[PDB]
Structure formats: C-alpha cells, structure tokens
C-alpha cells in the first residue's frame, strides 16, 4: 500500500494528507524537531513539502534513505546559484545574473544588469531590490551568500505546475497567472486554455528540467512574461501556492497528483474545463461571512493568525464567468482592505 | 473554532470530518465503543451519522445531550411506523401500508396490498437490510419477533426512484440540490445520476413535501427524501435525517457538498443554495477491493472509506462530473472492464441516462 511520510509540518503537508485520505493513501506530515520514532519512515515513500532543512535527529535518518523521492535533487534547487546554473546549462531563458561576491562588484553589476539589481539569498529566501545609490543597505552578510540579477520588467507573472512520473511521462495544468504584493503571492487566476505559445514554451522548459533532474512528483516553474517570451524566475520542487486552485478547479489536484507520482499510481492529464481564482488569506482571521457566497471554497490551515502569515486561501471556479466575477465583487467588502486590489486584478483578467 | 462530535464513526462521519477540516471545523466521528470521558462532547455541537443506535456508555451520554441537534426528532423518523404516519398527516403520498402486527392479518395484507408484500423493520434497517419481499406462500420466512415490529407496504412498480437532498437552517430557511436518480439492486444503492436542472414539476413537488416535513419537525441540518416515480406522481419512500448515500456526488459536483451543508446548518453558518452546473454520476463500491486502475481515468474521483472489505459492505464510491457528457459516457464505458461483473448493469444504467 500507500503509506507516505511528508517532511515538514506546514499547510502543504496538511493539504497533501487531506488529498490522500479519500485515495486510501495514509499521509504522515512530520516536523523537523520530531523524533525519528513517530515517523513510519522505514515502511513509507518519503517526500517533503519544504526545500531545505538542517540535519536534525529526524533528518539525519533521512540521509541516503532509499524511499526518499528526489532526496538528491532538493539541494540542487535549494541553492539559487546551482538552480540558476541549471537553467544556464539547459540554455533556458532566465534573468541575467551573477554570484554577488563583494561590494567591489557593484559598478559592473550595475553596468551589466541595468539600473535595478534584485539580490536574493542563495538559500532560505530574503530579497533586496537596489539601485546604485542604495547599495549600503545590503547586509554585509549577503556577500558570497546571494546572487544578484536583472530586475525584470515583466508584463505579468505565470507559473506552470506539472508532474513527472517514474517512467518519465509528464502532465501539466494550464498556466496560472499570479500577482505578488510585497513579495508575497496574493492572487492567482487560471484559464482552461492559456496562450498557446506560452503554454508550449513553459511545458517544454519544465519537461526539460524535470528530465534533466530525473525528478518524479509535482514541480512548479514560476516565470515572467516579457516581449521575448517567458523567462524562468525560480522552481519549487513540490506542490506550490500558485496551484491551490486545482483543489476545486481540476479533476485531479496538484496534491493528488504529487501523491500519485511518488507512489507510482496512474498519472493521466488532469481535466480543467473552467477558470478558477484563488485568493490567499494572509494574517487575517477566519470570517465565515465569506461562506455566504456559494462559489467560495474556504481552505483554512488552522495555523495561528499572525501578520504576514499564510493562514488559508479561498478558491472560486465556475463555467459562468459573469457569476464568478460577480462573486469576487461581493467578496471584496467581506475581506480586509488589503485584499481589494488583488481581487480587482483577478476580475480584470476576465475581460 | 467550530467543534462537532458525531454519533457514529462510519463512512458518513468520516466524510463529514473530511468536509470540515478545510472549513476550520474540527469534527470527531465517535464510535459507539468510545469512553465518554475521552470525547469532548460537552464542549461541542452534537450530531449523528446513524438513525438508530444500541445503548452503550457513549450513546447514553450523547443522545440525551442538549447540544444534540434534532435530538427529539430522531425518535420519530427512526421508527418507520411514526415516519409513515407523519407522511399521512401531511397529506404526503406514500405506499399503502400498515403495521404488521399478527399472522392473522396476512391474508388481508395480500388482499389489500397485492401479490408481494414489502415488510420493513420499524427501526434499524438501512442498505436494504431489515426488509423482506414476500408472496403469500412465503410468510413463513418472517422472524416471529417481526410481528409488531415491522410495517408492511404494497410493492410499488415505480418507473424510477429519485431522492431530494436538502437542508433547513436554524432560521427556517431551506436549500436543495437538484433531484438525484438512484438505481438499487437487491435493495442496496448501486448508482446515482444527477442533472443540473431536473423536471421542474417533480422538483417543485418534492421540495414542497420535504419543506413541509422539515418545518413540521423543526429540523436543522441535512435530510434526504427518497421517493418513487409512478404514474400518479411521486410517492415518498423514506427519509434519512442526515447526509445520505444518494448525495455523495455533491462532493465533486456541487459548489457546497452535502457534508459541508450539514456542518453549516448545525453550526449556524451561512446556508446559501449550492451551485450545480453539470451532471454527475456516482458508482457505489460494494464488497470490492480498491483497484487503482480506476485512477487511469482522469475524471474519476475515488472516495475509499478505509473500511474492511467484505460482501455487501459499502467500501467507497466513485464520482464523475463534467460538462461534456460524452466524456462521462466514455469514462463509464472504460470503467466496466475495471470493475467486478456485477457492476456492469448499474454503470450501463447510468450511461443510458445520457442517451
Ligand atoms: N529579477 C527579478 N526581477 C523582477 N522581479 C523579480 C525578480 N525576481 C523576483 N521578483 C519578484 O519577486 C517575487 C518573489 O521572488 P522569488 O524569487 O520567486 O522568491 P520566493 O522564493 O521568496 O517566492 C517574484 O515572484 C517577483 O514578483
Ligand atoms: N414499497 C416498496 N415497493 C417497491 N420497492 C421498494 C419498496 N420499499 C423499498 N423498495 C426498494 O427497496 C429500496 C430500499 O428500501 P428503503 O425503505 O429505502 O430501505 P433502507 O432504509 O434500507 O435504504 C428502495 O430504494 C427500493 O428500491
Ligand atoms: O517560494 P514561493 O514563495 O512559494 O514561490
Ligand atoms: O439505505 P438508506 O437508509 O437509504 O441509506
Ligand atoms: Cl448528517
Ligand atoms: Mg516564488
Ligand atoms: Mg521560492
Ligand atoms: Mg433508510
Ligand atoms: Mg433507502
């Protein structure tokens, strides 16, 4: 049978466990502080809902564990330097970049990357956007530990969520449009038919990366839409926030898909017929008033509400798009004010 | 948060728990063997996933608790004699029947009710168990203790069976799903098919009947009303004061499932009308082992109950829903060679609805 242990105790692991239950797959999400005992590791397929972790009592036991799918891929992707090098190695479009080694480097960096430099920690996410006058602000700790790239002026951001099976087969969801405010995802919208050139471009780059890594399971590739096409921003070797809409807007969710892949169950293409919109709930308390609107699917994480914390998400799907945007309209006043703009941005794509 | 304890830990209680977790409602399906001291029922909204129960330490405490929504209603619906009298009281058409109280009545039963008598136990029957179909020559098959504890009805030659699944809130408001077409074989549900828009007249009559019942009883939560489609219209077959097998398709084919609807009603949350745009088909899995080959068909939603697999036991269901019905028929076709032989007729029966 289907026994799965998930390294990491956050909402992604919870949604995976909720997904496996009606499939008859028992999923055990475990925190890094756990005792290796309470972990049915020795008889499970092992996966993670996190990207990197230190050696802990529990994790040490996971080192070289043969049931840990993709065990060896994580670190390649967890360090932005090696992740960017992978795109370069595959000749995949990505923002121009370099290791930011020393303050010495700034003028050339500016010369070459343009006016705005996006500095990102190599591991553990962690970002600064700087102009030549502002460089002092970057902590001295970053030198040697961050990459820096051209700030991309994209028209929008989209991510491709898909999965690759042990046999190399691949399946994908339509691209999803995502809006980030203060570096965090606030809203996502997916249409059953995306721009065909874009979709094709994304599936070919993601297939190429998954094949290269020998990856099995769900992976998300976030990209920037530019006049020249998509540029790859970053990868997530796991189910990703942008794909949550799949819980109610696809015949197979990203959670079920990930489980199917790693346990070697059937991996047909998920069916997506209507559009969906996802609104992330961040630092807000649950408001059951939202459930007055029948299209609203509430996904509460049962985490403590704190500022800037992802506490849940709302999914809405419908073949009637007038009904859908009307609902979004009705939802606005039921949410705290900082939600409005991302809702309006979502409604705008239905035009 | 919302905290709910359910009397019973069968598949219905499990699916109510699954529905609640994402809404932030902690739901505890409680087995009848639980020690009351070990269940937070005194701090919860209490409900039931079963109609009747034996007396155990846990049942004694829960069933009398003031937090048990519809506590005083269950007795009436749970006994088929009072359930039928209730239909009669509200002028609700139903099969001619009477209480089977003594052998001396048999001949009158047959004279009045026709060639086959349908005997149902007054309480504890579900899944087509606690029911016998008898010809005059077979009354010997009836357990002596049945006399006085069973009702007997005319065998109705319905052209089809449909059920109305709906809910009533503390505020008296009600919402309903479209009618669900149900196929039973050997008295157990095998397949359900629901369409976004049902026969309006039939949908209107059924709703009128269930609204009458729920309001007479002062019922809060989900209720299912199973009927027979005959040439004189619908007749009510029986009621289920809870989420019901024929409503399972709502997990994937409606915007709010029957499980979420029941939790909303009982916890006093909003009760809007669920949105249903496409048809859905539900295939019940009875006494069969799980076969992951089913997942090779992308529209299939597997709902495995993690229950012991043995003859006549409901072990899960498969839901399929899509706007393209050709997709559905095609998937139903593909499922036949992936299921035990006894499933073919029910699957074909569902495919037939779309042609
Ligand atoms: N080079 C860049 N140019 C412009 N914006 C960027 C660039 N890199 C990141 N961003 C913006 O920052 C967001 C978060 O950055 P990302 O690298 O995906 O970090 P994280 O791992 O924290 O999600 C992006 O989705 C995008 O909005
Ligand atoms: N009077 C009746 N006439 C013909 N068939 C009936 C009658 N009562 C029940 N049945 C058949 O038996 C099925 C189960 O009966 P029901 O009373 O619903 O019992 P249960 O509570 O076990 O589900 C019905 O759905 C129908 O197919
Ligand atoms: O990393 P993210 O943030 O999920 O993208
Ligand atoms: O069997 P039921 O009672 O109908 O569920
Ligand atoms: Cl119920
Ligand atoms: Mg990102
Ligand atoms: Mg990231
Ligand atoms: Mg019954
Ligand atoms: Mg019944």
Does A164 share its domain with A32? no
The neighbour count for residue B75, using CB atoms within 10 Å, is 12
Q: DSSP E strands: which ranges in B155-259?
A: 160-168, 174-176, 180-185, 188-194, 221-230, 233-240
Same-domain pairing of B299 and B350: yes
Protein residue with its CA nearest to atom 1 in ligand 3: A236
Using an 8 Å CB-CB cutoff, list residues of chain B that contact chain A.
1, 18, 21-24, 255-256, 264, 269-270, 272-275, 277-278, 290, 292-293, 295-299, 301-304, 306, 316, 322-324, 327
Contact A240, A254 (CB under 8 A): yes
Give contacts of A270 with chain B, Cβ < 8 Å: 298
Closest chain B residue to the Cα of A315, Cα to Cα: B255
Q: Give the technique used to solve this structure.
A: X-ray
CATH number for the domain that contains residue A104 = 3.30.1490.20
Residues of A with Cβ-Cβ distance to B296 under 8 angstroms? 266, 268
- Are A245 and A105 within 8 A, CB to CB? no
Site of tokens 């052209």 = B159
Task: List, as own/partner pairs, every contact residues A339-342 make where C-beta atoms lie below 8 angstroms and the sequence separation is at least 24, other chains included.
Answer: A339/A186, A339/A279, A341/A181, A342/A179, A342/A181, A342/A186, A342/A187, A342/A279
Q: Are B36 and B57 in contact (CB under 8 A)?
A: yes
Same domain for B216 and B84, yes or no, is yes
Strands A170-172 and A156-164: antiparallel
Identify the bridge partners of residue A17 per DSSP, sorted by sequence position. none
Strand A3-7 with A26-30, pairing: parallel
Q: Is A234 in the pocket of ligand 1 (CB under 6 A)?
A: yes
Residues in chain B, overall count? 355
Alpha helices in A53-105 (DSSP H): 57-60, 74-78, 80-90
The span from the CA of A2 to the CA of A259, in Å, is 9
- CA dihedral A185→A30→A25→A11, nearest 10 degrees, is -20
**CA-to-CA distance for A158 and A145, rounded, in angstroms?**
27
Beta-carbon contacts of A12 under 8 Å, excluding residues fewer than 6 positions away, are A49, A238, A239
**DSSP states along B36-86:** GGGS-GGGSEEEESSS-----HHHHHHHT-TTBTTTTTHHHHHSHHHHHHH
Q: Mark whether B170 and B78 lie in a shared domain.
A: yes
B61, B171: one domain = no
- Count of domains observed in chain A: 3
Contact indicator for B58, B50 with CB cutoff of 8 Å: no
Q: What ligand 2 atom has the least distance to the C-alpha of B153?
A: 1
Q: Which residue of A270, A272, A294 to mutate against B (max B Cβ within 10 Å)?
A: A294
Phi, psi values for residue B81, rounded to 5°: -65, -55
Are A286 and B323 inside 8 Å of each other by CB? no
Same domain assignment for residues B201 and B326: yes
Is B292 marked as binding a ligand? Answer: no
The span from the CA of B108 to the CA of B99, in Å, is 12
Using the Cα atoms of residue B271, residue B323, residue A252 and residue A174 in order, give the sign of their dihedral: negative
3-state helix, strand, coil in chain A (%, to 5): 35, 25, 40
User: Relative to the CA of A125, which ligand 3 atom is closest?
Assistant: 1
A173 and A316 assigned to the same domain? yes
> Does residue A67 sit in helix, strand or coil?
coil
Q: Cβ contacts of residue B187 below 8 Å, gap of 6+?
A: B127, B128, B129, B131
Contact across the interface for A270 and B298, Cβ inside 8 Å: yes
Q: Where are the beta strands (DSSP E) in A32-145?
A: 45-48, 97-100, 117-121, 127-130
State the smallest CA–CA distance between residue B243 and chain A in angstroms.
17
**Residue range(s) defining the domain that contains residue A36:** 1-70
Number of H helices, E strands in chain B: 10, 16
Please answer whether residues B180 and B140 qualify as being in contact, where contact means their C-beta atoms are separated by less than 8 angstroms: no
Overall resolution, Å: 1.6
Do the chains contact at A251 and B299, CB–CB below 8 Å?
yes
* Among A323, A314, A313, CA closest to A350: A323
Is residue B220 within 8 Å of residue B169, measured between CB atoms?
A: yes
Nearest residue CA, atom 24 of ligand 1? A183
Which residues are B230's β-sheet partners? B233
d(CA A86, CA A93): 11
Residue at a domain's end among B155, B181, B202: B155
Helix, strand, coil fractions of chain B, as percent rounded to 5: 35, 30, 35
CB pairs under 8 A between A and B: 85
Claim to verify: residue B125 and residue B199 sit in the same structural domain: no
* CB atoms A299 and B255 under 8 Å: no
The SS3 of residue A69 is coil
Q: How many angstroms separate the most distant Cα atoms in chain B?
A: 59
Distance from C-alpha of A324 to C-alpha of A250, rounded to nearest angstrom: 16
| Interstrand relation of B188-194 and B180-185 (parallel, antiparallel or unpaired) | antiparallel
Query: What CATH code is carried by the domain that includes residue A79?
Result: 3.30.470.20
Q: Are residues B210 and B339 in the same domain?
A: yes
Q: Is the CB of B114 under 6 A from ligand 2?
A: no
Tell the residue number behind the tokens 């993709």, with chain if given.
A70
Last residue of some domain: A151, A169, A198? A151
Contact of A204 with A212, CB cutoff 8 Å: no
Give the Å distances, CA to CA, from B167 to A79, A153, B335. 53, 52, 33
Total length of chain A = 351
For residues B71 and B7, is the Cβ–Cβ distance under 8 A?
Answer: no
Biggest CA-to-CA distance, chain A: 60
Distance B227 CA to ligand 4 centre (A): 12
Domain of residue A54, CATH code: 3.40.50.20
Neighbours of A48 (CB within 10 A): 25
In sequence order, what are the residues at sequence separation of 6 or more whose Cβ sits closer than 8 angstroms to the Cβ of residue A293?
A327, A330, A331, A334, B272
* Cβ contact, residue pair A265, B293, below 8 Å: no
Chain B: residue whose CA lies nearest to A15: B22
Query: Which of B277, B301, B292, B280 has the alpha carbon at shortest distance from B354?
Result: B280
Q: Sort out which chain A residues have CB atoms less than 8 A from B264's CB and list them.
A: 291
Give B211→chain A minimum CA distance, Å. Answer: 21
What's the DSSP call for residue B126? B
What's the rounded Cα separation, in Å, for the pair B135 and B146? 16
Give yes or no: residues B98 and B143 share one domain.
Answer: yes
Partner residue facing A295 (CB), from B255, B301, B304 = B255
Q: For residue A247, what is the nearest residue in chain B, using CA coordinates?
A: B252
Domain boundary residue among A55, A70, A85?
Answer: A70
Considering the domain architecture, whether residues B171 and B302 belong to the same structural domain is answered as yes
Q: Which residues pair with A156 in a beta bridge?
A: A225
Residues B132 and B224 in one domain: no
Q: What is the DSSP letter of B7?
A: E
What kind and span of H or E run contains A157?
strand A156-164
Q: Note whether A225 and A157 are within 8 A (CB).
A: yes
């Amino acid at each position: 049978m289907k026994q799965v242990c998930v390294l990491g105790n956050g909402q992604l692991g919870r949604m995976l466990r909720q997904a496996g239950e009606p499939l008859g797959i028992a999923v055990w999400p475990v925190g890094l502080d756990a005792e290796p005992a309470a972990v049915p590791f020795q008889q499970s397929v092992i996966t993670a809902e996190i990207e990197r972790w230190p050696e802990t009592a529990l994790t040490r036991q996971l080192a070289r564990h043969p049931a840990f799918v993709n065990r060896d891929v994580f670190p390649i992707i967890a360090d932005r330097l090696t992740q960017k090098q992978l795109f370069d190695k595959l000749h995949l479009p990505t923002a121009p970049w370099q290791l930011l080694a020393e303050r010495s480097e700034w003028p050339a960096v500016f010369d070459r990357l343009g006016e705005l430099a996006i500095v990102k920690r190599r591991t553990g996410g962690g970002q600064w956007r700087l102009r030549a006058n502002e460089t002092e602000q970057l902590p001295a700790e970053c030198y040697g530990e961050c990459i820096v790239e051209q700030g991309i002026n994209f028209s929008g951001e989209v991510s491709l969520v898909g999965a690759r099976g042990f046999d190399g087969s691949t399946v994908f969801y339509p691209l999803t449009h995502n809006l980030h405010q203060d570096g965090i995802l606030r809203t996502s919208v997916a249409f059953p038919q995306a721009n065909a050139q874009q979709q094709a471009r994304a599936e070919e780059m993601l297939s190429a990366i998954m094949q290269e890594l020998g990856y099995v399971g769900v992976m998300a590739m976030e990209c920037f839409v530019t006049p020249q096409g998509l540029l790859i921003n970053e990868l997530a070797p796991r189910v990703h926030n942008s794909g949550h809409w799949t819980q109610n807007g696809a015949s197979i969710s990203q959670f079920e898909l990930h489980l199917r892949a790693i346990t070697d169950l059937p991996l047909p293409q998920p069916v997506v017929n209507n559009p969906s919109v996802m609104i992330n709930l961040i630092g807000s308390d649950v408001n059951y008033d939202w459930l007055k609107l029948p299209l609203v699917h509430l996904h509460w994480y049962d985490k403590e509400v704190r500022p800037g914390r992802k506490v849940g998400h709302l999914n809405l799907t419908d073949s009637d798009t007038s009904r859908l945007t009307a609902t979004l309209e009705a939802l606005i006043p039921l949410l705290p004010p900082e939600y409005a703009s991302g809702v309006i941005w979502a409604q705008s794509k239905f035009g």
